Amino acid sequence: IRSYKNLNLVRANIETESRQFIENKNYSIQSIGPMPGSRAGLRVVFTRPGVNLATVDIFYNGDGSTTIQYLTGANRSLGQELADHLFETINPAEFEQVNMVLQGFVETSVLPVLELSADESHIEFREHSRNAHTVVWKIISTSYQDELTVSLHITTGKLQIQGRPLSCYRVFTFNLAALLDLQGLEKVLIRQEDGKANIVQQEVARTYLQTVMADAYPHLHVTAEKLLVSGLCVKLAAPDLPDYCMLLYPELRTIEGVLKSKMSGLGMPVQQPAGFGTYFDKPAAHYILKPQFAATLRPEQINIISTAYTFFNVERHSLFHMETDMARLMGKATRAWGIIKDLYIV
């Protein structure tokens, strides 16, 4: 079932979290300290009146891993409670491993997607290594201890992505989705090879798209429409996955296009330093256009733009920061289609 070996815990967060756990069930600490003996780690010995002393050993591995042992001592039933508290401070996406190869890349096409991914405030990249066969970049997250290894095999033009599907992976694949064919898109979105989005009848998917987007269908640019039909066939052919929310990437991307090109048609060009922020404020959970810009539009146009940016901003924020059933994804997908529709209808 559940295994506590080689966890990816934040080391600086262990002790604090353990202490507050103990104080939330009003248990009492017998001792918390460095682990005796060769191995580095933490020993937490706590109890509650009525049962024996629970001992939990927290070993520090050499690769930054952590292992929790609760089956020692005289109260394993109690120590497992602390073990589970520590285990549930980890994002599930931390128990996964990504190791993909995309075809047809060279350095002048890959560098831009890295620089766009480093235009977020919590993402940094740097050139890790290079010879004449491969060039390796690493993408680090400043808030979470998360690094993604992006290696470009020059002579084969093959791009390798290694690590865990966390915030660097998500930002990078989001900015990289603009360039990919159907199979590459399906690879980055479902994290599996041998996916079968390529067998979906593209003309039946296209009739799906005309049905849900009606009058906007002639105004879509084929950038937008071929990424929407490609998203449709990634969704229709998706396997069973614990989280489907990366499948929302194709729609968000086209929202980011259409909004960013509607607003510039109304005297609101989007720049690189400030971007969307210069044009919106945020009372409660809403984004609303600032009054100086809202006084130039009409009341129907102000809300199409505001709810569009709210949707785009908060679902990209929750995808990029790991929140910070295919039915939920389809609900958000059809909301998105309605949004892209309304933006073309106004």
List interacting residues with a copy of itself (CB under 8 A).
196, 199-201, 203-205, 207-208, 211-212, 232, 235-239, 326-327, 330, 333-334
Helix 167-176 and helix 249-262, axial crossing angle in degrees, nearest 10:
60
Give the H or E element holding residue 175: helix 167-176
Q: Residue 88 or 203: which CB sits closer to a copy of itself?
A: 203
- Binding partner of residue 35 among a copy of itself, Cl ion, none, CB under 5 to 8 Å per kind? none
State in angstroms the smallest separation of the CB of 274 from a copy of itself.
Answer: 37
Measuring CA to CA, how many Å separate 72 from each of 25, 40, 56, 63, 102?
21, 17, 7, 24, 46
State in angstroms the smallest separation of the CB of 103 from Cl ion.
Answer: 4
The single-letter DSSP state of residue 212 is H
State in angstroms the smallest separation of the CB of 185 from a copy of itself.
Answer: 16
- CA-based angle 304:309:315, to the nearest 5? 125
- Binding partner of residue 178 among Cl ion, a copy of itself, none, CB under 5 to 8 Å per kind? none
- Three-state SS at 194: coil
- Binding partner of residue 203 among Cl ion, a copy of itself, none, CB under 5 to 8 Å per kind? a copy of itself
What tokens does 172 get? 């990078």
Q: Residue 102 or 259: which CB sits closer to Cl ion?
A: 102
Give me the count of residues in the chain: 346
Beta carbons of 7 and 30 less than 8 angstroms apart: no
Beta carbons of 99 and 158 less than 8 angstroms apart: no
Question: How would you class 307 by CB atoms within 10 Å of its CB: exposed for 0-12, middle for 13-18, buried for 19 or more?
Answer: middle
Q: Residue 62 or 242: which CB sits closer to a copy of itself?
A: 242
Measuring CA to CA, how many Å separate 90 from each of 14, 64, 76, 323, 333?
11, 14, 22, 13, 28
Q: Residue 74 or 326: which CB sits closer to a copy of itself?
A: 326
- Binding partner of residue 183 among Cl ion, a copy of itself, none, CB under 5 to 8 Å per kind? Cl ion
State in angstroms the smallest separation of the CB of 189 from a copy of itself.
Answer: 13
- Binding partner of residue 330 among Cl ion, a copy of itself, none, CB under 5 to 8 Å per kind? a copy of itself
Kindly list the residues in this chain that would bind Cl ion in the complex (CB under 5 A). Answer: 102-103, 183-184
State in angstroms the smallest separation of the CB of 324 from a copy of itself.
Answer: 19
- Binding partner of residue 237 among a copy of itself, Cl ion, none, CB under 5 to 8 Å per kind? a copy of itself
- Binding partner of residue 33 among Cl ion, a copy of itself, none, CB under 5 to 8 Å per kind? none
State in angstroms the smallest separation of the CB of 331 from a copy of itself.
Answer: 9
State in angstroms the smallest separation of the CB of 104 from Cl ion.
Answer: 7
Q: Residue 72 or 198: which CB sits closer to Cl ion?
A: 198
Nearest to 305 by CA among 292, 322, 317, 293: 293
State in angstroms the smallest separation of the CB of 237 from a copy of itself.
Answer: 6
Q: Residue 12 or 327: which CB sits closer to a copy of itself?
A: 327
- Three-state SS at 90: coil
Q: How far apart are the first and last CA of the chain?
A: 53
- Binding partner of residue 207 among Cl ion, a copy of itself, none, CB under 5 to 8 Å per kind? a copy of itself
Tell me the C-alpha distance between 98 and 119, whole Å: 23
Q: Residue 73 or 157: which CB sits closer to Cl ion?
A: 157
